[PDB]
Design a protein around this ligand. Structure first.
Ligand code: HEC
Ligand code: CUA
Lengths: 134, 129
């Protein structure tokens, strides 16, 4: 039933989006926390999220509710995870791999991202901040 | 040099040295605060080599992140960025007799394998919440 609805957006894209995790933080859509949110259609906004060492860029991830947000998260170092507490977003973030997930926030508030995937001694404190605008 | 490594600091603390509220603490007008403490300079190196991880409260603002363990960088590089940031904002000019970070101080700490989770205690021991 999930594949027969827009709920399938919470599932990572089937298309491969491999890039260079070394310069992805210096050159590219993940090299600027300002132009991270780019409109890609009617009420559709693509947000590039860079998941580096114990951090997430941009932060806090401010996005509008009632719109289709195309989250494109990638890692420039080790493996990470994009599990937003309070949502259905649970996708793995690999190094140099752009995990694309389409979400639609129907409720505002502050959400914390839980990085399930290991990463150093402070992997448990790797909590990103998401703020959906009402 | 210090500028080359500064590019890495900009990834979280930005080029403004303000950071992100609730994620990354500020450096401008904060390094001097630590440099004035007994062992504050050592902490600055430890927080770079290994890091820190908790919910520190700077100026009443609490965060929830982790310092990046720049152990992959050379001792000279680690000291270079420290000297660069301290002189960049001029925080090193707000202390009496600022001693430039030397690779020697980095080496002595690099030999002592610690964890960012343990550094949290060391930081709080200095009175830093
Ligand atoms: C994200 C990948 C970071 C990068 C890159 C750098 N720092 Fe950082 N730093 C980060 C966090 C999340 C924190 C706070 C940890 C927490 O528990 O919330 C810090 C902290 C510091 C501090 C200490 C501040 C304090 O004790 O009040 C310093 C001095 C510091 N960071 C320095 C620093 C330098 C020089 C960097 C480039 C070499 C650098 N940081 C990068 C996250 C990140
Ligand atoms: Cu990044 Cu766990």
């Amino acid at each position: 039933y999930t594949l027969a609805t827009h709920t399938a957006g919470v599932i990572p894209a089937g298309k491969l989006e491999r890039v260079d995790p070394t310069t992805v933080r210096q050159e590219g859509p993940w090299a600027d926390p300002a132009q991270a949110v780019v409109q890609t259609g009617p009420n559709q906004y693509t947000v590039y999220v860079l998941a580096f060492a114990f951090g997430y860029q941009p932060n806090p991830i401010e996005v509008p509710q009632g719109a289709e947000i195309v989250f494109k998260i990638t890692s420039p170092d080790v493996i990470h995870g994009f599990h937003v507490e309070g949502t259905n977003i649970n996708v793995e973030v690999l190094p140099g791999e752009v995990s694309t997930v389409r979400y639609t926030f129907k409720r505002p508030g502050e959400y914390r991202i839980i990085c399930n995937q290991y990463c150093g001694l402070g992997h448990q404190n790797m909590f990103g901040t998401i703020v959906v605008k009402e | 040099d210090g500028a080359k490594i500064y590019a890495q600091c900009a990834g979280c603390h930005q080029q403004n040295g303000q950071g992100i509220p609730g994620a990354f603490p500020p450096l401008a007008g904060h390094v001097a605060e630590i440099l004035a403490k007994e062992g504050g300079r050592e902490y600055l190196i430890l927080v770079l080599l290994y890091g820190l991880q908790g919910q520190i409260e700077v100026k009443g603002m609490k965060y929830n992140g982790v310092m990046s363990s720049f152990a992959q960088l050379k001792d000279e590089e680690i000291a270079a960025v420290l000297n660069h940031i301290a002189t960049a904002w001029g925080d090193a000019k707000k202390v009496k007799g600022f001693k430039p970070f030397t690779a020697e101080e980095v080496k002595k700490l690099r030999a002592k394998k610690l964890t960012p989770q343990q550094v949290l205690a060391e930081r709080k021991k200095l009175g830093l919440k």
